[PDB]
Design a binder for this molecule. Structure first.
Ligand SMILES: CC(=O)O[C@H]1C[C@@]2(C)[C@@H](C[C@@H](O)[C@H]3[C@@]4(C)CC[C@@H](O)[C@@H](C)[C@@H]4CC[C@@]32C)/C1=C(\CCC=C(C)C)C(=O)O
Ligand SMILES: Nc1nc2c(ncn2[C@@H]2O[C@H](COP(=O)(O)OP(=O)(O)O)[C@@H](O)[C@H]2O)c(=O)[nH]1
Ligand SMILES: [K+]
Ligand SMILES: [K+]
Ligand SMILES: [K+]
Ligand SMILES: [K+]
Ligand SMILES: [Mg+2]
Ligand SMILES: [Mg+2]
Ligand SMILES: [Mg+2]
Ligand SMILES: [Mg+2]
Ligand SMILES: [Mg+2]
Lengths: 666, 86, 205
RNA sequence: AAUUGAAGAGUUUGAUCAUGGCUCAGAUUGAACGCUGGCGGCAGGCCUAACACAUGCAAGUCGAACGGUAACAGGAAGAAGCUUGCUUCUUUGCUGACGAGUGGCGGACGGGUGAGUAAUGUCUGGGAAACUGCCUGAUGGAGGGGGAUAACUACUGGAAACGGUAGCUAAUACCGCAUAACGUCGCAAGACCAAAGAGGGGGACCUUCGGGCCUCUUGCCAUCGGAUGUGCCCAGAUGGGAUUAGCUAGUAGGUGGGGUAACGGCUCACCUAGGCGACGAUCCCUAGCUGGUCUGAGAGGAUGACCAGCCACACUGGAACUGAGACACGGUCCAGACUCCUACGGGAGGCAGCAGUGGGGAAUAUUGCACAAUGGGCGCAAGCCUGAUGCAGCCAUGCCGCGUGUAUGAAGAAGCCCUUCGGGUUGUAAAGUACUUUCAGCGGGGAGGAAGGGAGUAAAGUUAAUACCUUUGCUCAUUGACGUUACCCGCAGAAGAAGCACCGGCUAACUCCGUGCCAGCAGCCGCGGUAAUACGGAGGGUGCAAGCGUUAAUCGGAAUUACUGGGCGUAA
């Protein structure tokens, strides 16, 4: 009838880090520890506190999962490798969490690794991440020697006697480490003192900071995302894991502590409705994950921001504007999946039997009409031309793409009309690889990917006057038409500009529109390599007509003939789509980026020192740009980002153009 | 079986099946002896064998192993053959 | 379920007063009865047999305020009932409590009378009835609630009824505000304007 | 009184008559889609994949069969666990209950589905050669013994599934014996066949102190009846195809034996050479049948969701067993396909029961509540079980009812639209002024579905007894999921409630302005190239209304398969 754990006790946390930082190991250990004495989120109990943990991937390709998790999470734990410290993807996940303003604590894992330097790791936090971080704990020894951790806040020591995380003997700080601990505690106070003016004055007064007093200030600072507590330990050797859990309860915010989400009323988008974490308030939940369990069926995970939900009820998806039958509510635990009857505010739960529900949707009561702000996912960085191996697969391919698009927001699929080609878009090579393989097996659709075909255009390089004449009196009815047109190269981007300079009505007014129509149709067809002719002006200066044989169709034919002869004299050239590329990277990799551009037949338009990452503006052929994402990340150590948008059509290099003609010919 | 009663009924049916088969075999054995005696041509032997069968078949019909019509048919058919055999 | 548009337009279209107003003033003052409603209302086009039959059926519906579905069911019942289908149909439309109330003079208009029925003001044989479609049988006492007696609108309606011709099949007493449905109105009693034969034809096309 | 019953139109031509097809106006639907959407009642709701299924539930009950007594409360006893006997801790089927087991009955009902089947089906009308738990009539019994065995106990192998071995023990379990004809067999004489006891109470009577005896209640056995159900036979009727004409060899018949509850090539041996078919055999295709439903003036045509009867089926293909009844949805065995668990040594399963999942699809709902009522199983009863059934949820899916106000209100305002630039139309429509509040919301009160079953209390019967028990009165306290019930009263406020298609003709409704054979429209005829009542948009109108259109589908109109009720000189 009542929630077992109060809103205060609830702790929705997430684990984020670089690849192989030890997220899975940490989560597994956490679950074991909470459990003793899978899915999207697992519920756990620690010191009479509900801890809903979500493990997020480290790869840039799976940034989606980090993004969606952060939206529906209160706190987070950043795991770091002791040897390497902050790594490229740690920076990415940090910035993501900064956007959502998620309070975070740092755990320096792998203290047993060779080259492990806690101090170095802490330094990287300050330099690379430029964040107010300070150690709340100090390690005693490094690598193999590391066998003890110091609680600086309480000035205590814990001697781990084994790698089983049991029989830990709490002892007094070693006198040798005591001096170090004192200095560290001083620094800890100072950092939190910057956040807490009261604490600062207490520090300035040189009055011994109470352990409770300090903890309260640290809690506040962390919750305000102004200070970042730094912990240490080894998950593999079961050291510091328990202390981290304690710090989660002591520092990471509760659903109440976190700032309230404001949802725009559906009826009045202008109207803004703040949603507090009150169970009595109207129910409001956000679906963040949509998976299909093999046993129960489709499982939609959601986070109850406000109100309460009971199983066997009807709710309304404000986003979709449709009623949803909440038949069953499952809560995933460390081992088994238990069916809950009621979900309260600040709780993460999975609904079984929901239909037409996607990630980012606001599920609410029928009376309720609030729409909580949805999550923002990035745009594809890599595009590939997917296609089925067989025609039978094409049907299945369509269905597969739909489902995949629903499951993964960042995955996108579309069909380019010009090329008539379905193009898949993703956050990286690894991402699209996984998606393709899934189609091959799960969906059983054998597909082959490749470079997206590029649509080219043509234009006349020279200006020439040409006459087009038609005559057909061979069989019965005779048709005649004559037109003198001048095809002059038009300013790039201006487009077709037909000029009626007919004087004395040499061409009848009624036939003149048909002349243009004929040209347009002929220009739509290729004059060189079957590519639409663009950026050409046609001037109808002179012509002729035979009242009897004058037919609009004849003039249309005459117009086509004129364009043909123009091509023979106007030097038609192939044009390629050029894209403005905006690349942002640390100045260290600037030379490499510019080199890559000038290697891909690109030109640097200029540069600008936006923030701490120099932004380079450049124009590069679309065909050349294929595969820039991977190379960019290779050159920038996965610290580079780019955006490409079509700018203009430019002439293809004669050699490349020659190839295009050959290809289109056969 | 999934139902408790079904499990029990299966056990009880096997118990019955065995009992019934033992009784049925014995009855048939006795009937065959009469038929064999008729084939042999010994009216006295046939009559003697029939007199042994009569109580058995009648009791079996009463128990429910066979029907009274079945018992009657056996006695009637044999009697006719025995009388002709004489 | 009810027509809530301009009542005068209906009468203008049919080219005859359908008694949709109280009748305190001349319909002519209220609207141009002669002209049909609309921009082209003045022009009078030739009407085909279908058009003639349709207008007749519509007229009767408009007078008694019955929608097509319920009216069609009435026709079927009339055909089922032994006798002249056309006349039977008219009798059914008359039997409606709402019509009875208006005719008794408890309501100024059938629209108003219907509001009285819906508001439970009317009592048939001492029993509250809130269905206008209710068919009042012969020898039935139709009274009005005590609260309804107090309503000033009822009193005014009675006055208008005095001006109108008195139904020969209804015995109504003022003050008591109680009427008696003596019998079903005969075709002779019913207006001769109604061409029931056309309606029968339309519903047998 | 059941008796009402029969409509045309457009389209071949320069025009005409005829012929003939096409199209249209009407009903009906398990409907779907688009747009729209206030309430209530009643009903309906996978037509697709007899596709595959996670999870719970859908068949148990009886201690008045039996050995018991694990489990909880007692009953005495009791170291009384206990110390004030304060508290009440050991015992024992003792004893109300009661796990597991043995036994009985049910599980062959109820519920689902229509795959197969053109007839070992259905329907209609008959027939003889049968059987039938429970229920009910009549006439007699129910005597006296034996041998087992589960549970249990000891031991022991399993990951599990579950077992193995040696003792042990009871019965309404099992089996002889006795007796038995209104039974069966037989010409007759003869021969032969059955049982079960268990509860309630109590007086002479009694040891074996348990009982016994008396009586009451229930059950058992035999035979003959009833009722009910079921098996079997026959005739007629119940689709299409000859671009299917021959088919058959247990086949057709006979005799004898065996077999069945019973008739019978049912089966087998033998003998005969038959049997069937143009009145359609054989073969192929399609399909559950019916009462009925829809349409039609009728004759017909179409159709067989929901309801009721019948049949068939239960993962697929076989097979028996048990039983009154099955060749058995939630039983067994074998085989197969498929899936699952595992300790890898082996196991497990069948939603075409109710929910529900995945899939397929244009498309069809909740893993709901109660056994209150009806009905069913078991029981002495109380009671227990019941996804039957009663209700609730969702859905405008249909049918029906209702509301979204009523009256008044003219320079008839504004605005829009048209305009003959005068006005007109929108339009009493608005505003305004009076006025009533259903329904909705809020609050309050409050039917019936409830009959019985209990505790007894009295009388009658009951017999030894006034016992017991039964029956009938009588008294008393209770028995509802729906349910915040139907319904009534009060509350304040017109508040909270109108949409959709159409306007060239057919066919009710017409203008303005765009567009200019384009863009579009379109059931049919046809529209669109300078205004187009046909498109596009606006005003106005028309038809319907919480619906309105569209698509699909059936019949009608269609005398257009013409039995009713048509034609063949030139139209077939
Ligand atoms: C649990 C967690 O943190 O991330 C999990 C969850 C994870 C991100 C998975 C990698 C990858 O399939 C992910 C994508 C985007 C792959 C493409 C689609 O199918 C998505 C619908 C899918 C959602 C999440 C998922 C399934 C994980 C990884 C990454 C493994 C690394 C490599 C190189 C394959 C992981 O478990 O380490
Ligand atoms: N040396 C060391 N290795 C560790 C530690 N914790 C985890 N690992 C290992 O580092 C790897 C981390 O893998 P995983 O937990 O999946 O990391 P994730 O990619 O961040 O989820 C594994 O091989 C772990 O066994 C630790 O404390 N020390
Ligand atoms: K015709
Ligand atoms: K045969
Ligand atoms: K079968
Ligand atoms: K004829
Ligand atoms: Mg991991
Ligand atoms: Mg079939
Ligand atoms: Mg016909
Ligand atoms: Mg003819
Ligand atoms: Mg001819």
């Amino acid at each position: 009838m009542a929630r077992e754990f109060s809103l205060e006790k609830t702790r929705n946390i997430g684990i984020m880090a670089h690849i192989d930082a030890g997220k899975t190991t940490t989560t597994e250990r956490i679950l074991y520890y909470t459990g003793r004495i899978t899915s999207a989120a697992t519920t756990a109990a620690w010191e009479g506190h509900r801890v809903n943990i979500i493990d997020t991937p480290g790869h840039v390709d799976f940034t989606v999962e980090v993004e969606r998790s952060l939206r529906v999470l209160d706190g987070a734990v950043t795991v770091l490798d002791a040897q390497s410290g902050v790594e490229p993807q740690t920076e990415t996940v940090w910035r993501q969490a900064t956007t959502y303003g998620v309070p975070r604590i740092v755990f320096v894992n792998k203290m047993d690794k060779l080259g492990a330097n806690f101090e170095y790791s802490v330094s990287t936090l300050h330099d690379r991440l430029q964040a107010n971080a300070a150690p709340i704990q100090l390690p005693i020894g490094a690598e193999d020697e590391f066998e003890a951790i110091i609680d600086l806040v309480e000035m205590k020591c814990f001697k781990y006697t084994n790698d089983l995380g049991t029989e830990i003997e709490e002892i007094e700080i070693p006198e040798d480490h005591l001096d170090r601990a004192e200095e560290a505690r001083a620094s800890l106070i100072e950092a939190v003192a910057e956040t807490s003016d009261e604490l600062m004055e207490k520090y300035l007064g040189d009055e011994e900071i109470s352990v409770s007093e300090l903890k309260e200030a640290i809690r506040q600072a962390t919750t305000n995302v102004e200070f970042y507590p730094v912990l240490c330990g080894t998950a593999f050797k079961n050291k510091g894991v328990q202390l981290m859990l304690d710090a989660v309860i002591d520092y990471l915010p509760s659903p109440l502590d976190v700032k309230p989400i404001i949802g725009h009323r559906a009826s009045n988008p202008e109207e803004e409705v703040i949603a507090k974490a009150d169970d009595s308030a109207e129910f409001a939940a956000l679906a963040f994950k949509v998976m299909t369990d093999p046993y129960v069926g489709k499982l939609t995970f959601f986070r109850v921001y406000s109100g309460t939900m009971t199983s066997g009820s009807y709710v309304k998806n404000s986003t979709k504007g449709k009623r949803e039958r909440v038949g069953r509510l499952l809560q995933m635990h460390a081992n088994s999946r238990q069916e809950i009857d009621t979900v309260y505010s600040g709780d993460i739960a999975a609904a079984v039997g929901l239909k037409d529900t996607g990630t980012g949707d606001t599920l609410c009561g029928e009376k309720n009409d609030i729409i909580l702000e949805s999550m923002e996912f990035p745009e594809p960085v890599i595009h590939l031309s997917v296609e089925p191996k067989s025609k039978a697969d094409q049907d299945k391919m369509t269905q597969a793409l739909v489902k995949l698009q629903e499951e993964d927001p960042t995955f996108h699929a579309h069909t380019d009309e010009e090329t008539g080609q379905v193009i898949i878009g993703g956050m990286g090579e690894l991402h699209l690889d996984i998606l393709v393989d899934r189609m091959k097996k799960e969906f059983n659709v054998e597909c082959n990917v490749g470079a997206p075909m590029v649509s080219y255009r043509e234009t006349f390089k020279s200006s020439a006057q040409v006459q087009g004449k038609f005559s057909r009196q061979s069989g019965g009815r005779g048709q005649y038409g004559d037109v003198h047109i001048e095809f002059t190269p038009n300013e790039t981007g201006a487009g077709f500009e037909f000029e009626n300079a007919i004087v004395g009505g040499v061409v009848p007014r009624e036939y003149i529109p048909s002349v243009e129509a004929g040209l347009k149709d002929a220009m739509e067809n290729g004059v060189l390599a079957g590519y639409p002719l663009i950026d050409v002006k046609a001037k109808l200066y002179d012509g002729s007509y035979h009242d009897v044989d004058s037919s609009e169709m004849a003039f249309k034919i005459a117009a086509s003939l004129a364009l043909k002869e123009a091509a023979k004299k106007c030097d038609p050239v192939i044009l390629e789509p050029m894209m403005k590329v905006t690349i942002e990277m640390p100045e260290e990799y600037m030379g490499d980026i510019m080199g890559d551009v000038t290697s891909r037949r690109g030109r640097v338009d200029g540069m600008e020192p936006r923030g701490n990452a120099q932004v380079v503006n450049a124009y590069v052929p679309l065909s050349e740009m294929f595969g820039y994402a991977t190379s960019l990340r290779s050159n920038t150590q996965g610290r580079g980002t780019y955006t490409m948008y079509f700018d203009h059509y430019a002439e293809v290099p004669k050699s490349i153009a020659e190839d295009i003609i050959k290809k289109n010919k056969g | 079986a999934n139902i408790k009663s079904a499990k029990k009924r299966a056990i009880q049916s096997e118990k019955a099946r065995k009992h019934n088969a033992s009784r049925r075999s014995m009855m048939r054995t006795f009937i065959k002896k009469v038929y064999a005696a008729i084939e042999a041509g010994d009216k006295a032997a046939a009559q003697k064998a029939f007199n042994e069968m009569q109580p058995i078949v009648d009791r079996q019909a009463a128990k429910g192993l066979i029907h009274k019509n079945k018992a009657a048919r056996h006695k009637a058919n044999l009697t006719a053959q025995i009388n002709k055999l004489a | 379920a009810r027509y809530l548009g301009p009542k005068l337009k209906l009468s203008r279209r049919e080219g005859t007063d359908l008694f949709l107003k109280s009748g305190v003033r001349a319909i002519d003052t209220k609207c141009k009865i002669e002209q049909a409603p609309g921009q082209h209302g003045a022009r009078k086009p030739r009407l085909s047999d279908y058009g003639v039959q349709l207008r007749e059926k519509q007229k009767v519906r408009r007078i008694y305020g019955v929608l097509e579905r319920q009216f069609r069911n009435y026709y079927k019942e009339a055909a089922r009932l032994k006798g002249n289908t056309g006349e039977n149909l008219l009798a059914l439309l008359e039997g409606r409590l709402d019509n009875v109330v208006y005719r008794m003079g408890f309501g100024a208009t059938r629209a108003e009378a219907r509001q009285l029925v819906s508001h439970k003001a009317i009592m048939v044989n001492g029993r509250v009835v809130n269905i206008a479609s209710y068919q009042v049988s012969p020898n039935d006492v139709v009274s009005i609630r005590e609260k309804a007696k107090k309503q000033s609108r009822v009193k005014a309606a009675l006055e208008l009824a005095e001006q109108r011709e008195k139904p020969t099949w209804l015995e109504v007493d003022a003050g008591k505000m109680e009427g008696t449905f003596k019998r079903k109105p005969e075709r002779s009693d019913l207006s001769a304007d109604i061409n029931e034969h056309l309606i029968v034809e339309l519903y047998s096309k």
